[PDB]
Amino acid sequence: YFKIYSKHTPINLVRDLPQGFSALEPLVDLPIGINITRFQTLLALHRS
Amino acid sequence: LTGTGVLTESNKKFLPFQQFGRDIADTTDAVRDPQTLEILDITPCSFGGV
Ligand SMILES: *[C@@H]1O[C@H](CO)[C@@H](O)[C@H](O)[C@H]1NC(C)=O
């Protein structure tokens, strides 16, 4: 089971993690049943 | 989930994920009914010593 917990927070701090507390609610539970040891972040390019 | 009690209306603001509630003893104190998704409070039936 892949448990994803999520929380969306309005912030206005420039560079670093804001200092505070916010508990993450559960978003979705996925029955994937696969081995995971490595992961990747996906970004988006901007072209002009 | 089995038990005995009186089912009454409640004012406990459950979050969407949240289904049931538990007391210190871990006995269920509130439950969300299937089919209609409403939140029912479970209050033990009156008892005491004679
Ligand atoms: C049946 O249960 C589902 C929850 O799984 C609910 O969304 C739906 O409204 C229910 N339908 C009826 C007719 O009770």
SS3 of residue B42 by DSSP: strand
d(CA B7, CA B45): 10
Question: What residues flank ligand 1, with Cβ below 6 Å?
Answer: B 34-35
Closest C-alpha among B47, B32, B35, B41 to residue B6: B41
A6 within 8 A of A33, measured Cβ to Cβ:
no
Phi first, then psi, for residue B16 (nearest 5°) are -45, -45
B41 exposure class (CB count in 10 Å sphere: 0-12, 13-18, 19+)? middle
Q: Helix, strand, coil % (nearest 5) of chain A?
A: 0, 25, 75
Q: A25 to chain B, minimum CA–CA distance in Å? A: 8
Q: Does B17 touch chain A (CB under 8 A)?
A: yes
B4-23: string of b/e by CB count within 10 Å (b at 16+)?
eeeeeebeeeeeeeeeebee
d(CA A35, CA A37): 7
The residue of B13, B17, B18 whose CB has the most chain A CBs within 10 angstroms, and thus the best one to mutate to test that interface, is B17
Experimental method: cryo-EM
The token pair that represents B11 in the structure block = 């004012």
C-alpha distance from residue A20 to each of A9, A17, A23, A28 (Å): 11, 9, 10, 25
The token pair that represents B20 in the structure block = 């049931």
